[PDB]
Design a protein around this motif. Sequence first.
Motif, PDB file in Angstrom:
ATOM      1  N   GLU C 113       1.416  -2.814  -3.533  1.00 50.69           N
ATOM      2  CA  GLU C 113       2.278  -2.719  -2.364  1.00 50.69           C
ATOM      3  C   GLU C 113       1.841  -1.558  -1.489  1.00 50.69           C
ATOM      4  N   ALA C 114       1.472  -0.437  -2.119  1.00 45.57           N
ATOM      5  CA  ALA C 114       0.996   0.712  -1.367  1.00 45.57           C
ATOM      6  C   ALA C 114      -0.356   0.471  -0.720  1.00 45.57           C
ATOM      7  CB  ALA C 114       0.933   1.950  -2.270  1.00 45.57           C
ATOM      8  N   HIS C 115      -1.323  -0.077  -1.460  1.00 49.56           N
ATOM      9  CA  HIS C 115      -2.666  -0.265  -0.938  1.00 49.56           C
ATOM     10  C   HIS C 115      -2.736  -1.354   0.109  1.00 49.56           C
ATOM     11  N   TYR C 116      -1.839  -2.329   0.080  1.00 47.88           N
ATOM     12  CA  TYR C 116      -2.028  -3.503   0.909  1.00 47.88           C
ATOM     13  C   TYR C 116      -0.904  -3.732   1.902  1.00 47.88           C
ATOM     14  N   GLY C 117       0.218  -3.034   1.771  1.00 45.92           N
ATOM     15  CA  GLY C 117       1.337  -3.274   2.655  1.00 45.92           C
ATOM     16  C   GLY C 117       1.909  -4.665   2.474  1.00 45.92           C
ATOM     17  N   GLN C 118       1.784  -5.209   1.268  1.00 47.52           N
ATOM     18  CA  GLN C 118       2.303  -6.529   0.956  1.00 47.52           C
ATOM     19  C   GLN C 118       2.842  -6.555  -0.466  1.00 47.52           C
TER      20      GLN C 118
END
Lengths: 52, 246, 177, 185
Positions: C113-118
């Motif tokens: 979630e942090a690395h990809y914004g998803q």
Amino acid sequence: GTYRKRFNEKARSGHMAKLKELKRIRNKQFTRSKVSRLKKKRLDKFIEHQLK
Amino acid sequence: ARGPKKHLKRLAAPHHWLLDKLSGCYAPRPSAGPHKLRESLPLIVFLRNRLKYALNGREVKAILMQRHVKVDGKVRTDTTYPAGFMDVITLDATNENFRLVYDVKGRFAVHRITDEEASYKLGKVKKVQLGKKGVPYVVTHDGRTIRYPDPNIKVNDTVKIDLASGKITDFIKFDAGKLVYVTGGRNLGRIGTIVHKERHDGGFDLVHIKDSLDNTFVTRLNNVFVIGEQGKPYISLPKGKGIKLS
Amino acid sequence: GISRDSRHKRSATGAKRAQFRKKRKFELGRQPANTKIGAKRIHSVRTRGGNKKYRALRIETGNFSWASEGISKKTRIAGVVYHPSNNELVRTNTLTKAAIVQIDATPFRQWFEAHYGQTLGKRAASAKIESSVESQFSAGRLYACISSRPGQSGRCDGYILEGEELAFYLRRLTAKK
Amino acid sequence: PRAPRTYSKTYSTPKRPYESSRLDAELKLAGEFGLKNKKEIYRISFQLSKIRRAARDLLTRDEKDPKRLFEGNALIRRLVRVGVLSEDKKKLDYVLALKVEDFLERRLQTQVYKLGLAKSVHHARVLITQRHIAVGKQIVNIPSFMVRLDSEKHIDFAPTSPFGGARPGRVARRNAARKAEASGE
RNA sequence: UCUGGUUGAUCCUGCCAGUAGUCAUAUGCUUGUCUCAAAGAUUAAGCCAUGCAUGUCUAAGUAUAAGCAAUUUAUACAGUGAAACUGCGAAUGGCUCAUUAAAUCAGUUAUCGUUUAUUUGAUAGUCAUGGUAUAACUGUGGUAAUUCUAGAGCUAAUACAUGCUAUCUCGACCCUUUGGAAGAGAUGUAUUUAUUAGAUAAAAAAUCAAUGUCUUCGGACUCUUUGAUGAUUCAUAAUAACUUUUCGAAUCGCAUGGCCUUGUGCUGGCGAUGGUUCAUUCAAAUUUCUGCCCUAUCAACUUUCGAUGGUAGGAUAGUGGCCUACCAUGGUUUCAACGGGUAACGGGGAAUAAGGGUUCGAUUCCGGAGAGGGAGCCUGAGAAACGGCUACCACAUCCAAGGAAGGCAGCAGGCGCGCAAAUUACCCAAUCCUAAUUCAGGGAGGUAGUGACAAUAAAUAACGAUACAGGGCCCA
RNA sequence: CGGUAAUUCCAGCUCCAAUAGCGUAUAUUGUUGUUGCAGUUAAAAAGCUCGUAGUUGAACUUUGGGCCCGGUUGGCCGGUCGGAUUUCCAACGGGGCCUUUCCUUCUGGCUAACCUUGAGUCCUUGUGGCUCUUGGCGAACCAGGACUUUUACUUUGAAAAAAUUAGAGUGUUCAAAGCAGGCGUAUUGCUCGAAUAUAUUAGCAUGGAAUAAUAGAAUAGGACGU
């Protein structure tokens, strides 16, 4: 000299036990006092003669 | 034995050491060091049995405490210090140097050596590797571990090393028609120039060598030790020049 | 104690070997660390030379690698799901090498979630992941393989199960249920 | 433990222990060279057997073979260095021809008897065990020295001996003492 | 391997006679010398009184012995040094071959399948210095007894447990040299895990995704590093984390210089220990080929209980059924498997013959095995140790009856018959070895002692004279 | 027969053997046979016929010729103040060509060597002698690939600790032994040694190509090839 008559069998007791194990396992392949014996034989003969 | 031994019989010594059977039951078991066991020489056997300057362990022990001799500039105080082939032995109070080098008789051999020849020493590079942090380095035949060598050098290569800095003076490659010393084997000490090398993949590679009397023989690369070029040794050679005769 | 000699075994001619000598120290065998799940429990042993070796007795968490991401997180271990040698070790939840277990999914999902914004469940070409991995993320338990020897290293360091072996071992789990 | 010091029995018994011809051989040579022992005879004959055996081995070996040349040279030079084999006889057939009588001559008691320093060979062996003659400079009380040529030129009385050297012996000095005592009495 | 005997004589088949040795084993007699040299055997690897055989210290690990020496510079200390703590050794040496028949041993491998205390050579920028103790020692005690100890009071470490203290790269500018410069980037190991790199066989294009020097904003891509092995996921480099988180000197001895802001401030020599990694050396552990005595009136054998092969784990220092699971049914053998016999430790070597051979080899070297025997273990780099420990059995010891200790196939020395065979010697002066370390110590070892092991040289008399007689000698 | 301080009386007999060693007792001398036994009769051959293993097994396949070269010996030789090596033929093996005679291929390298050629020539009329290099020697083995009958046999080498065996040298006084020693300006130092051989089975490398096999291209599924 595998099954050897030692000088001190009370000393080679556990030695004797493990040698007994060896003899049993090795001749598992095969298996899978003389005056007393002569008196036994002649006893059979005398008993059988009395039967006769 | 439930470990290593501290003991060395009389007859258990290597035959080239030329030590009698009768003045001992024991040979001095050499300590660990650069060279391996059978191709070495303890300093007390060197001094007493060749230089004859001491006759007892207490004598040579007192000498070692007197801090005289420096092997390659470094003093040892070990009696059974494993001195091997191609060694520099420095004598201060007698003002001499000595190259330890094999005999034509298959034995070892002292060589009277001047200071300029003692300033350097020779070495067969036996393994070049790449160490941690990608550092390149070599280990010689005498156990000298040298970082950052010339890249053209490979294994088994002769290198002149200045002892005073412990640094790579120069090197000598492994070509045919190079002057070679033979260190082990039956024919050891017989200095000759290499004919060629019979190479075997994974096998003990044999080497054909012809010396000055045009005599050819074959040894193994482990016994092979290149000295220099033809008529160009970097060292002074003893009498006989490593030549077998009748 | 235990040894691992050969002169006790049968000959290649099916012959029984007489004992050659007394058992030596250097051919000894030690007890296996039947590492299970529990509060952190580690012993050490001076192996030959003096070389230390760490047995794990009870160990709660572990470290696990996402290979397709090349990352690794220290997650907690749920329990032993499959073992190719012993369903008894499956039952007893014993932690050794080559084991199929479930672990946490929240720190890796928070990393995603942090690395990809998803989120997970419910750079997108890079963010496309496997559907069963989405399923394990939505469940919160991740299938992983112990490939470490806590009985020797004291380490429980594994990796997440990926496509082919996940399909294979899910066939295995489906056939074993 | 140690190193075994190597040793040897220096002789060997003959094949037939009793034969008249060899018995008279031994008696003749013994009373000839002042000898005393069958075992000494066995020593010297054992030496000859060994030497001429190896000689025959060299004969069987091929000519101009360097081993044969080397060994023949060494054997011949040792023989002539002792003084057994002669200069003109420097070939292997003569080496086969050498004899125990030549060795018994090359023995020292024989040689000093030839030198006439004693009336008998036995008398020479007596003087030998009295230690009255030194070879070169070395005093020897062994009659079986097997000298070399320089040494047999170098036979001489001992300078400590009362004969070829120092003061007379205890018998002479005690008789002179008793004689001086009686004359002064 | 031969010599003699029947007949008037001769030849073979014959019989008989004679014949030989053998560090073979005893035994007897004798024995001066010199030198050298040995010194097992009941198929008892049966059993032991005693005594002895392992501890070690330098200037330099820990000193207030109320130890000594006084004394002359030492009011912390300085010399020596009991004891004690700490270090290392005590996993070699010596003795024996019980056991063991492809086992060892030997030759020949190989470990890219293992660890290595130590030697040696390299190898690390990432508080004017915490604490805990305890021995030794002081003091109270136990008992029949042991190299037994209890309570208490001190005090230390190189103990124990802690613990902090700039460098490159690019580089605008400036100026040209002897350059010096704003700015941008980066900066230990150790373990573990997952990923990447670690190349090379001879041309050039299109494509997308990503966008790097110069942008001559169009784009060209113009130079493009990589080791080795027969070979490698190897050496080596990078990424992301991991650790009941390792190391990166809280040490010591000799001396004391150079500075200078006159601080008791800053720098500085010699050597000593320790320390990570690698390499070495010494190792050890596995591993290949080839080779064993007899036995078929021993032909089938191994596989529940691993026997053969597979997959996974464990364990290990590692490979490996070594073990565990789950799998397949294998494997060997008349070219003799198997099992049995072996007063069978293997070899170099020893004897013998002319050779072919034969027979030994406990026995000076090497290899392996063991230390009354079963079972098991601690420490340590190294033990399944036995002049270490736990239990069994076998004996066997002391006593106050309670408990206590035990391993001579080490050095002398002893029993095992009622008949009998080395010295309970001296020294570590040699060769070595061990340690803190020249100096300590060593039944290893040497010295000498001790039944004609075996071996070398050789004495018990030379020489003459004289008298006494004709007799003396050889063969048949 | 008398005697025991009484008798000096084979004086105290002779001869053979070894000797500082010697005797005795017990056991072991082409009669095991690959070398190298036997099977008419003193002991020992299958009732007949077949028949597993094993052993053992007709003949044949590149031979022959020629060239050139040079060693290694025998003699005619001797130059020299005890051997140097020239001419010659006899042989004895050896090497290189050609005679129908794989001699792995190419990669490039290193060219190995005159089928190369550009000039001169020391010296007995000179195929009796050689310095440098312009198109060149594929095999000179380098490193790169990719394959090619395997043996047995036998030659050579490296190996097979030392000790022991053999053996060099050395007046331990000899000798067993042992590896020392020997030689100055003994007033202050010079040198030699401590050889050599053997060591067999397996292994490795190596030459050989007789012997003895082995395998090939027949349902060609074959070979070389622009």
